[PDB]
Amino acid sequence: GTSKLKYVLQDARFFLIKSNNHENVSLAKAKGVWSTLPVNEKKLNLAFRSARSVILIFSVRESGKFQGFARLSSESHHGPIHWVLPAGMSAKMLGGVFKIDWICRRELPFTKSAHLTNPWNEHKPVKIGRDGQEIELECGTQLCLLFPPDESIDLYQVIHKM
Ligand SMILES: O=S(=O)(Nc1ncc[nH]1)c1cccs1
Numbered sequence: 482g483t484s485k486l487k488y489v490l491q492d493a494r495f496f497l498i499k500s501n502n503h504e505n506v507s508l509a510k511a512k513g514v515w516s517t518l519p520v521n522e523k524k525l526n527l528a529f530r531s532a533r534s535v536i537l538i539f540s541v542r543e544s545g546k547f548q549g550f551a552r553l554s555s556e557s558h559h560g561p562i563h564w565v566l567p568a569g570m571s572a573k574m575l576g577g578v579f580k581i582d583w584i585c586r587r588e589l590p591f592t593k594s595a596h597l598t599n600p601w602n603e604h605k606p607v608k609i610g611r612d613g614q615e616i617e618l619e620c621g622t623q624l625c626l627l628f629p630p631d632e633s634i635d636l637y638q639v640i641h642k643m
Pocket residue numbers: 499500501502505515516517518564565566567570612
């Protein structure tokens with residue numbers, strides 16, 4: 482069913498996350514963590530205090546798909562995730578580490594979200610946006626509901642953290 486999923490997304494905020502490679506999304510799925518650059522880290526920390534749920538929707542650059550979505554369970558904290566960093570991306574260049582609970586680990590191709598435009602990015606298709614781009618509530622909710630159901634996930638424990 483979709484009822485607990487809809488409850489988790491109620492009055493949520495949504496942010497597009499762009500990962501340079503698949504390895505870091507795989508690590509995030511395995512370890513329940515994410516890190517971003519300080520400009521986006523500040524935005525997510527503000528949002529985490531401000532909303533019942535902050536949802537990160539992940540897309541690997543050039544993949545043509547989203548790889549799933551997750552809910553922040555903490556603000557960022559410091560003090561060492563073995564991110565696969567491209568040349569020019571330093572471990573210190575990143576911010577802290579956010580803990581996340583995956584809501585859906587399944588893929589969604591961009592072809593299936595072509596009817597969804599993001600008011601906060603000039604009504605461009607929701608697939609379009611820089612890392613950290615906020616997605617307006619209605620568009621973000623509909624995008625999350627397009628993903629295939631992930632039957633491996635039990636949202637009972639996530640609801641209790643709200
Ligand atoms: O360098 S990434 O593969 N992608 C990225 N987007 C914006 C800054 N970095 C990475 C993902 C997670 C830790 S490091």
